[PDB]
Design an enzyme around this catalytic site. Sequence first.
Site, PDB file in Angstrom:
ATOM      1  N   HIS A  12       0.725  -1.265   0.000  1.00 18.51           N
ATOM      2  CA  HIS A  12       0.000   0.000   0.000  1.00 18.51           C
ATOM      3  C   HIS A  12       0.749   1.306   0.000  1.00 18.51           C
ATOM      4  CE1 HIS A  12      -3.401  -2.617   0.730  1.00 18.51           C
ATOM      5  NE2 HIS A  12      -2.785  -3.129   1.792  1.00 18.51           N
ATOM      6  N   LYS A  41      -4.795  -9.797  -7.657  1.00 22.06           N
ATOM      7  CA  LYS A  41      -5.542  -9.399  -6.422  1.00 22.06           C
ATOM      8  C   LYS A  41      -6.684  -8.502  -6.909  1.00 22.06           C
ATOM      9  CE  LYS A  41      -4.668  -7.165  -1.968  1.00 22.06           C
ATOM     10  NZ  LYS A  41      -3.733  -6.400  -1.087  1.00 22.06           N
ATOM     11  N   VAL A  43      -8.780  -6.147  -5.373  1.00 15.65           N
ATOM     12  CA  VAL A  43      -8.813  -4.765  -4.919  1.00 15.65           C
ATOM     13  C   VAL A  43      -7.558  -4.388  -4.157  1.00 15.65           C
ATOM     14  CG1 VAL A  43     -10.116  -3.060  -3.589  1.00 15.65           C
ATOM     15  CG2 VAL A  43     -11.249  -5.106  -4.370  1.00 15.65           C
ATOM     16  N   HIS A 119      -2.629  -3.639   8.099  1.00 15.96           N
ATOM     17  CA  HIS A 119      -3.659  -4.052   7.117  1.00 15.96           C
ATOM     18  C   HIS A 119      -4.475  -2.852   6.691  1.00 15.96           C
ATOM     19  CE1 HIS A 119      -7.623  -5.971   6.110  1.00 15.96           C
ATOM     20  NE2 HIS A 119      -8.108  -5.110   6.998  1.00 15.96           N
ATOM     21  N   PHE A 120      -4.818  -2.777   5.414  1.00 13.80           N
ATOM     22  CA  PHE A 120      -5.625  -1.691   4.867  1.00 13.80           C
ATOM     23  C   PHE A 120      -7.073  -2.208   4.815  1.00 13.80           C
ATOM     24  CE2 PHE A 120      -5.551   2.412   2.836  1.00 13.80           C
ATOM     25  CZ  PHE A 120      -6.846   2.504   2.379  1.00 13.80           C
ATOM     26  N   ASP A 121      -7.937  -1.630   5.649  1.00 17.05           N
ATOM     27  CA  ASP A 121      -9.340  -2.025   5.735  1.00 17.05           C
ATOM     28  C   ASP A 121     -10.254  -1.365   4.750  1.00 17.05           C
ATOM     29  OD1 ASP A 121     -10.849  -3.886   7.455  1.00 17.05           O
ATOM     30  OD2 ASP A 121     -12.064  -2.092   7.794  1.00 17.05           O
TER      31      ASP A 121
HETATM   32  N1  LIG Z   1     -10.341  -0.435  -0.057  1.00 10.13           N
HETATM   33  C1  LIG Z   1      -9.619  -1.568   0.072  1.00 10.13           C
HETATM   34  C2  LIG Z   1     -10.215  -2.805   0.504  1.00 10.13           C
HETATM   35  C3  LIG Z   1      -9.401  -3.861   0.623  1.00 10.13           C
HETATM   36  N2  LIG Z   1      -8.072  -3.730   0.338  1.00 10.13           N
HETATM   37  C4  LIG Z   1      -7.146  -4.873   0.354  1.00 10.13           C
HETATM   38  O1  LIG Z   1      -7.895  -6.040   0.114  1.00 10.13           O
HETATM   39  C5  LIG Z   1      -7.494  -6.924   1.136  1.00 10.13           C
HETATM   40  C6  LIG Z   1      -8.663  -7.777   1.430  1.00 10.13           C
HETATM   41  O2  LIG Z   1      -9.819  -6.950   1.579  1.00 10.13           O
HETATM   42  P1  LIG Z   1     -10.933  -7.243   2.715  1.00 10.13           P
HETATM   43  O3  LIG Z   1     -10.834  -6.033   3.601  1.00 10.13           O
HETATM   44  O4  LIG Z   1     -12.119  -7.325   1.820  1.00 10.13           O
HETATM   45  O5  LIG Z   1     -10.487  -8.485   3.416  1.00 10.13           O
HETATM   46  C7  LIG Z   1      -7.074  -6.046   2.306  1.00 10.13           C
HETATM   47  O6  LIG Z   1      -6.194  -6.775   3.186  1.00 10.13           O
HETATM   48  C8  LIG Z   1      -6.330  -4.956   1.636  1.00 10.13           C
HETATM   49  O7  LIG Z   1      -4.999  -5.397   1.299  1.00 10.13           O
HETATM   50  C9  LIG Z   1      -7.506  -2.536  -0.076  1.00 10.13           C
HETATM   51  O8  LIG Z   1      -6.293  -2.395  -0.311  1.00 10.13           O
HETATM   52  N3  LIG Z   1      -8.306  -1.485  -0.195  1.00 10.13           N
END
Ligand SMILES: Nc1ccn([C@@H]2O[C@H](COP(=O)(O)O)[C@@H](O)[C@H]2O)c(=O)n1
EC number: 4.6.1.18
Length: 124
Positions: A12, A41, A43, A119-121
Amino acid sequence: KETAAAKFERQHMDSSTSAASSSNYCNQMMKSRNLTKDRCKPVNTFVHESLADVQAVCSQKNVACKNGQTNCYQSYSTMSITDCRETGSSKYPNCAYKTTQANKHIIVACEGNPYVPVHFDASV
Ligand SMILES: Nc1ccn([C@@H]2O[C@H](COP(=O)(O)O)[C@@H](O)[C@H]2O)c(=O)n1
């Protein structure tokens, strides 16, 4: 392998640029950060702020993560971000993404010591 904080940065962080310019930004970055390696991947968000500014979010607004855990934090202000979404036509290993540049608040899950983003939520 990779520590959780190092994996979050590789997936990210993109502070070298202030914002995505071409609609090609996501195809290039997803490839170069090895996110299309075993699959495409679906998203992935890139943040164009300094690493220090993103880590500071771990001491900002505490909110629940989508998973129900409560170690998520929302930034008080908006940040430059690029949302990368696989297109409906994309097919591993010919991964294709739609690039969306915006300024929004980010939500990250934090852990450890030091307490940093792992982690990016979501982005709001
Ligand atoms: N807006 C978002 C939603 C999810 N993600 C990525 O997708 C991965 C999996 O998404 P979830 O939150 O759906 O589990 C996250 O760990 C993150 O790396 C992202 O980078 N941006």
